[PDB]
């Protein structure tokens, strides 16, 4: 991916995070678990539903379009009519296939950027109260109980509070 | 639709495509 996160420094995905597209896995003395990140999953679902609606709205429905009949003395306009019908089909087929190919690439890069944005948000929060251990994990220098973990996932982690409590 | 270019009523646009699947989610990597 263009942003190095998905299939990048975060080596793989989580079948155990079921409530969203991006999120957290935590691990402290009380226990472990997954939790989707609602705010960022929501923003992506906004954009992707918008993307799909955009594709729909641009392909107005085809109304009644039947063929025509020609005599054995009208083959030039018969072939012209065939040329027109075939031509437009070749063009909408190209348009349809190309749009989906290009939008598919952008959609995947979009998800990749969203994961990277989330990781950097947490990194910016924890600063040097935790060790960046690669694979997208932060190892805390202080005890981080469930309330501590919950505050990281809310974006209201308290870097001054824990900077004095390092192990 | 790829069924037929002649249509009566309110139909999808005809294309010659055989596949047109549009990603909504991300790259699926369950086992590493």
């Amino acid at each position: 991916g263009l942003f190095g996160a998905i299939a990048g420094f975060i080596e793989g995905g989580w079948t155990g995070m079921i409530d969203g597209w991006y999120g957290y896995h935590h691990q402290n003395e009380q226990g472990s678990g997954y939790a989707a990140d609602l705010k960022s999953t929501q923003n992506a679902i906004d954009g992707i539903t918008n993307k799909v609606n955009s594709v729909i709205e641009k392909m107005n429905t085809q109304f009644t379009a039947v063929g025509k009949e020609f005599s054995h003395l009208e083959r030039r306009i018969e072939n012209l009519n065939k040329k027109v019908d075939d031509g437009f089909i070749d063009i909408w087929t190209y348009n349809a296939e190309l749009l989906v190919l290009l939008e598919n690439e952008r959609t995947l890069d979009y998800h990749d950027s969203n994961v990277k944005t989330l990781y950097e948000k947490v990194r910016s929060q924890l600063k040097n109260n935790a060790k960046e251990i690669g694979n997208g994990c932060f190892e805390f220098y202080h005890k981080c109980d469930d309330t501590c973990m919950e505050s990281v996932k809310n974006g209201t982690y308290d870097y001054p509070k824990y900077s004095e409590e390092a192990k | 639709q790829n069924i037929h270019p002649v249509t009566i009523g309110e139909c999808p646009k005809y294309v010659k495509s055989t596949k047109l699947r549009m990603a909504t989610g991300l790259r699926n990597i369950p086992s590493i």
Partner: antibody
Amino acid sequence: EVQLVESGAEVKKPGSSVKVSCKASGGPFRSYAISWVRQAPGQGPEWMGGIIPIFGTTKYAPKFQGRVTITADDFAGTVYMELSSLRSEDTAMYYCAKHMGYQVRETMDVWGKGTTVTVSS
Amino acid sequence: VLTQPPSVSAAPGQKVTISCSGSSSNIGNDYVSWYQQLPGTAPKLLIYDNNKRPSGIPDRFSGSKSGTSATLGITGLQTGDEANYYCATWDRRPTAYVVFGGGTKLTVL
């Protein structure tokens, strides 16, 4: 705003099943969940279950767990609700309501006008 | 389930309060919403996330949550405010689901 429009009234016999629908304006894909809530005469609302956009996952209340099936035709901007083994106690007004976001939750901010299902012998 | 008083009454211009009492599985660990219901019409959201109002709900409606009990408040009571009021929340009891209170009928004199 958003308009939720339920399908017509239904009158069905016990043990049969009914499939009502809810058509939403705009879209047709939505970024918010939709659930179904019913309310029997002289009673409070009771949630039945809901469905999540893109993921398509569903949650059902324990009381209807096992005989309710919520589905979605996002291209038609429509959501369906099928309830089976109908009892007389199922006679109520059925509403579809949307949630503020993509997860089903206690907060449903916009409701349809409701449709009635009557279950009698 | 959530328990509310079955019925409360007051004269116009007064302030009433509707209590919603649950357990640690519902109200004590999740947000609380309130709905108003008029005869013949669908439930109308008044309060979400314990104490926030949607657009269009007047200043005199308010809510709060203390530990295990939530509370709806209405001031400047009007004749049009005579309806059924329901609290709702996200119960983690058996399988998680949305649970409504029993309801509270507000009568104006």
